C-alpha cells in the first residue's frame, strides 16, 4: 500500500517562519497514524473535534499540513479560542477544527551559540485575520496619523522583528516546531484512509 509522505513533513531540514507558514496537501495514499502516537519526542498531541482513538478508523478525502517555529510560551496560543501575538496576528485557527496539533522541542537543531536571527513574525496588524489567512506583505503600520509614507520615523514602526533564539534561556524561550494537521471531508471519494 502506497504510504503518505509523513516523513518529509516532520523530518524537514528547514522550517519556515510563523508569518510565512507553509501549506502542503496530501492525497491518494494510505495514512499511517501508528508512527505518530507511538513516539515520545513530541510534547503536545491534542486533537480537536476528532478523537485519536478512532483516528485509524475515521478517514476522509483531504489532509492539510502546516509547519512553523514558535517558542514555549505561545504553544497554548495555537489552540482555538484564546488570543495572543501568535493568535490575533500571524497564524489563526477556526473554532470548528476537526484536526490535530503537533509540537516538539528542537533547541540544538534550530539555534546556535551566536543567536538565531532568521525567524520573523508580525508584531502588529490593522486588525485580526480570518480563520485561515497568510500575511506576507511587509507594509508599514498605520497609526492614528501616518505621515511617514516610506520612512521609519515616529509613529511608523517595522512590522517584522527578529526572533531571539539563544541556547541558554529557559524552557519557554526555547524554539518549538509546531505542525498542524487539518482534516476535512468533501463530496468526493476518499483518497487517504486507514490501513486494514
Amino acid at each position: 500500500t502506497n504510504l503518505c509522505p509523513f516523513g518529509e513533513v516532520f523530518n524537514a531540514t528547514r522550517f519556515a517562519s510563523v508569518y510565512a507558514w507553509n501549506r502542503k496537501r496530501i492525497s491518494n495514499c494510505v495514512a499511517d497514524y501508528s508512527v505518530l502516537y507511538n513516539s515520545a519526542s513530541f510534547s503536545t498531541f491534542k486533537c480537536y473535534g476528532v478523537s485519536p482513538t478512532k483516528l485509524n478508523d475515521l478517514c476522509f478525502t483531504n489532509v492539510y499540513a502546516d509547519s512553523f517555529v514558535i517558542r514555549g510560551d505561545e504553544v497554548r496560543q495555537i489552540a482555538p479560542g484564546q488570543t495572543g501575538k501568535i493568535a490575533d496576528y500571524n497564524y489563526k485557527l477556526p473554532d470548528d477544527f476537526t484536526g490535530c496539533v503537533i509540537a516538539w522541542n528542537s533547541n540544538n537543531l534550530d539555534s546556535k551559540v551566536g543567536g538565531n536571527y532568521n525567524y520573523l513574525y508580525r508584531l502588529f496588524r490593522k486588525s485580526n485575520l480570518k480563520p485561515f489567512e497568510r500575511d506576507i506583505s511587509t507594509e508599514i503600520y498605520q497609526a492614528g496619523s501616518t505621515p511617514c509614507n516610506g520612512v521609519e520615523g515616529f509613529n511608523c514602526y517595522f512590522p517584522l522583528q527578529s526572533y531571539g533564539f539563544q541556547p541558554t534561556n529557559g524552557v519557554g524561550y526555547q524554539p518549538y516546531r509546531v505542525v498542524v494537521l487539518s482534516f476535512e471531508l468533501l463530496h468526493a471519494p476518499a483518497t487517504v484512509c486507514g490501513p486494514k
Partner: antibody
Amino acid sequence: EVQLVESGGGLVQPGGSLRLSCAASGFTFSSYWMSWVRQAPGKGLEWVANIKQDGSEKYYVDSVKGRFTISRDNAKNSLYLQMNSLRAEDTAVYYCARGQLGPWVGVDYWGQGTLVTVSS
Amino acid sequence: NFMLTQPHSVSESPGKTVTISCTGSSGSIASNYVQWYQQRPGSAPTTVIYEDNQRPSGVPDRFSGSIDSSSNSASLTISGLKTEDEADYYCQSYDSSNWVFGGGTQLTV
C-alpha cells in the same frame, strides 16, 4: 477479556536484586505501550517507568533512574522489570499498566499487583 | 516540576452532586489530556473517564467532566452518587517524557 497476573517477590531484600514479571494474555502484546505505576501505603499514586512497544524507548524520573531497568519480550507475551540497590522508601505495591494509545491518553487496563517490602 | 494540586476529602455530601477540581502549577493543563482514575483501596483500580470527555464502555453516564482554561483546572462531576462511588480519584496529566499524578480525593459518604 484480559489477564494481567504477575509473580513479584514480596520477600524482604535490603539493597539486593529482585526481578518482577507481569504476564499478559488476551491481546496482541507487540501493539501497545507498557508502563509501571507505584502507590505507597496510605499515600497517592505515582509514576515509575514506561517502555515503548518495541523496547526502543524507556523513561524514568530523577529518583528511580540509574537503579531500575525494564525490558519487554513480545515473543512470550510478557514483560520483565529488574531493580538493584533498594532503599527505604521502596516499600510499596507495584502495578503493571498498559497504554490505550501510547504515552498520551494513558492507562486502560489495570493489573492485580504484588506488594514488595524492603526492611532490615 | 509539573505538580498537580488537588484537595483532600473535599466531597462530604451524602447526596446532591459532586465536584472535584485538580489544577496545575508549571504550565497549562489544557495542552495535554487530563484524566481521572477510580481506585478502590484493597482492590484493583479501573478507568472511570479517559481523554478530555470520553466515557469508556461499562462506565455509567452519571460520571462527567469539564475543562476550564480560566483557572487552569479540570473538573469531575458525579450525578447519581450511590454507595458504589466510594473511591479516591487521581488526576493524571502528560508531560514531556514524564507522567504526573494527583494527590487524590477520598470520597466519603
